[PDB]
Symmetry: D2
Subunit: 261 residues, 4 copies
């Protein structure tokens, strides 16, 4: 098939990429970075996120594979020593695909833009105080005051979400999880505190109270949005597809990354 | 239909029950506490849990309704002032049922018993230290040392689970959530810390390391089990069914109970 | 004595200030905003923090008093209805002073500046990733990766510190407390997690690892510092002095602000 | 001087004890377990706590030393390889003592008993629900509902207190810290949530609301108390004294135990 390989750009990753390209040259595999059907990421989870956003317009036609040249990643879960076995198995086909849910972010302005997240989307204030009204399925839920909010995909729950006290969710669950960043709670100000897990088709809307300018992040990309009227979150209808060649369960990846290896 | 009414047993609940029984007497409704098809709980969430465990062998043939005579409950979400409208609508039928997931607990002994939970099942030690091996789908995940563990249903996540730092999950998600009670973490002892959310068909097994005696709770019922070899958790194939007469969304119940009313 | 009155600037506060100024005019009290000995703050805790930083060069010669025109404050703990009794008692003297500890922040640059904090001093990164080496009394303690760090005074522990999970400390304890903002913890990255409480004369030093640019806040003031080589924290030798006219214990203020009133 | 040596009772500890006893036999050191002036603990922190409670009536006349034969302890902070250097230095004297604060627990009954804690004192319910009124210096602070409460010494803050989310406090601070175990917080029930740090002479009183029977722990000792009317906590006037032969700072012990070694 058509394939491409992205690299972290250091010496170890660039040369693994060149060696894998040489290995694919012994098969009916064409290097095409415009319309690939297999995207291999060599580096870390940051490199894998760049590869996902590089091709997020052809998610249904692409299967992703991640190789970690440093520590084990949650998306880059193949070792460099197995690049050869991977080259061959990818060329011989007969691999099954696995799909993870994604998060859709919609930003409406005053006087509309959509984004997909593989890890999470976060909202923070432009330096000053952060006050937003949280509306769930058109129902006003809370007035949040604090540092910000984070909405995570299932596979994203082991990332920022985990540091904010969120639960780890198996990626077979089509859901999104909202966590607070340093919420103020006293006699007059009140939030739920606990993380919130939302199913498919639930819409969470963040609406400004005073300042209309927010710092909005989608995975690694952080931008200042101005004249924002609403930020809408829902589980995407789209999915990211991985190529799977053997059993590496999610809970084993969790164990290997946080407990022991 | 056949119906029964359980009461908290205080003066307000007993007399609401007698008044509702009188109202049902004007319809084709027979009081039958052996094989009811409608079970009305009058009291609090504790009363509702007793009604659920009183009839957990006929869950598929029963629709539950809860009336709160004290504060608003998450299961007893009808006010006493609407008992009359409720009597009439229940008798005229034409109500839709909603279903919440349940948790199955299996306790195997040395030399097997199953339970259903509507809120959660918890495990603690018989006074001494609590050490269990946590195995997820036959994979050893962690050795837990601490006060205990709690496995919650979705509707249970606003109860003990919430106090232990777990996420609140919409009850349309068929899942279970595991939370830690005061886990020890140092150079030699290590747990994940974060709550864990498991989908249908995942099996979480707790296996003793030293002491084989544990205090096992299922909702309100707490018993000392001896010679335990394994405690198995999975989302039940069974569901509890509620009678619904108007829209009272889960996130609104969450708002009304924890934020404001 | 010489006194001055600062105001939040809204209608209620400005006119309470004018009425109190008229009341002081019936005593041997001179309005002097250059070298006052009594500083009265009318507004909220934000107004009181501005009054403290407005006169932090004469802390030993000033006793502070806060009046809250909105909700009860932890520093502005007098009601507007008692302004008259306060005018008279302040003029008749015979009040005792109470003193709270302060936090000294030192920022050293490449190729030195000091600040006092009444609530806390926080450090965040200039948008990118935040990595600092944490050194306690010249001993390398941890490499922190996350959103930032917060060092709180005792009276500051009910503010940002509380939202970050820190303990509430009685202000008679001469200490400072360090809390983490969303620290990453996995197989390769490790922090203590727990808040840390330091006694007098302990020095906590934050030293950059990669980026040398940080957003440093002292109470309400947040500035971007560039070419930073070190941020040093220690309990200040200076203290803020309050004028006390009756018993309003710290734990009662805590109760009134977070539990009920 | 007079000395004694307690042992964990395993093979490694018993024989280290016998070898140290032989080494002391070459000096003017008499083994006396009735009125020792030096108490050496060989084992873990549990062994050291037993040695402390074994001699808590002569705390002012005893200096403690802990040797860890397993992992590093916070009280047993000497390695077995340095037993010989320790034998000699203890016999030659010229060591300085360091003192850590202690926690006094008073249990009053219906129709009085005092305890000292080196780590903490905890209160839990006799199986049923735990409801106590929390009174600070005769002021009603909160009605606690949950699993229990823990009051920790400074050196105890790295133990149970840490697992409950409490702050780590340097042992030079004469204080005690109260942490909650799984408190319920909703519309009707309310606690502070945050850990609370109390100075010397502050008295925290726990008073029953319904059930008068509680499980009260002092360090490792857990007993069921009946007809309890009050549990009082305050920083003890007594102190535990350690023998110090070189610099091993508390924050380094924290680093070595929780971060890396
Ligand atoms: N030597 C670099 C040090 C800097 C570094 O923190 N780098 C990111 C770290 O995260 C891990 N990671 C990523 C990633 C990534 C790429 O950065 C962007 C993501 O930063 C996360 N992020 C941001 N601020 C965070 C915080 N305060 N705490 C925790 N994560 C935070 C967000 O979620 C972004 O989306 N995805 C997952 C995942 N799916 N599962 C578990 N681990 C994951 C990476 O292997 C790396 O260890
Ligand atoms: N005046 C009585 C004071 C005593 C009282 O705590 N009573 C239970 C409280 O819980 C609420 N509750 C229940 C219930 C119940 C019946 O008790 C058994 C349940 O105790 C929970 N439980 C046990 N220990 C807990 C703890 N430490 N913290 C929080 N909950 C805890 C477990 O989960 C049991 O299954 N279910 C839910 C729910 N689905 N959603 C939100 N709130 C819920 C009740 O209205 C009541 O406010
Ligand atoms: N309607 C305004 C909404 C905006 C507002 O959050 N305003 C500050 C709030 O705090 C209270 N406050 C202050 C203050 C202040 C003045 O702002 C600067 C302080 O913001 C704190 N701050 C910053 N980010 C925070 C966060 N994420 N969570 C909690 N606090 C946070 C820091 O600590 C600064 O130093 N000091 C204390 C105190 N000593 N004890 C208890 N409560 C305190 C104020 O009465 C007000 O409710
Ligand atoms: N292989 C045994 C496994 C069993 C074991 O947990 N054992 C106790 C563990 O603690 C450490 N420890 C002790 C101790 C002890 C002696 O037990 C009594 C103490 O258990 C603590 N304890 C009770 N339940 C706890 C919980 N859920 N989480 C954390 N600690 C808990 C209380 O605080 C008692 O007072 N003191 C300190 C200290 N000063 N600093 C840091 N670490 C400390 C010990 O080296 C050992 O690793």
């Amino acid at each position: 098939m058509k394939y491409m390989i992205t690299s972290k750009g250091d010496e170890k990753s660039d040369l693994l990429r060149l060696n894998m390209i040489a290995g694919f040259g012994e098969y009916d595999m064409e290097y095409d970075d415009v319309e690939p059907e297999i995207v291999i990421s060599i580096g870390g989870d940051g490199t894998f996120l760049s590869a996902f956003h590089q091709y997020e317009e052809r998610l249904d036609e692409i299967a992703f594979i991640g190789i970690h040249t440093g520590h084990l990643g949650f998306y880059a879960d193949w070792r460099p020593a197995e690049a050869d076995k991977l080259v061959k198995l990818l060329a011989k086909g007969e691999y099954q695909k696995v799909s993870y849910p994604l998060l859709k972010t919609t930003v409406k302005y005053g006087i509309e833009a959509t984004y997909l997240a593989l890890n999470e989307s976060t909202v923070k204030s432009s330096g000053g105080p952060f006050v937003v009204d949280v509306v769930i399925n058109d129902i006003h839920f809370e007035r949040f005051r604090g540092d910000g909010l984070c909405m995570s995909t299932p596979s994203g729950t082991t990332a920022y979400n985990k540091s904010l006290g969120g639960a780890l969710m198996h990626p077979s669950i089509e859901a999104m999880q909202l966590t607070e960043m340093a919420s103020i709670n006293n006699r007059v100000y009140r939030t739920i505190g606990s993380p919130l897990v939302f199913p498919k088709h639930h819409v969470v809307s963040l609406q400004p109270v005073n300042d209309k300018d927010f710092q909005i992040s989608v995975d690694h990309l952080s931008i200042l949005h101005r004249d924002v009227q609403e930020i809408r979150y829902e589980v995407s209808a789209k999915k990211i597809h991985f190529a799977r060649f053997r059993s590496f369960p999610f809970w084993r990846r969790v164990h290997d990354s946080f407990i022991e290896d």
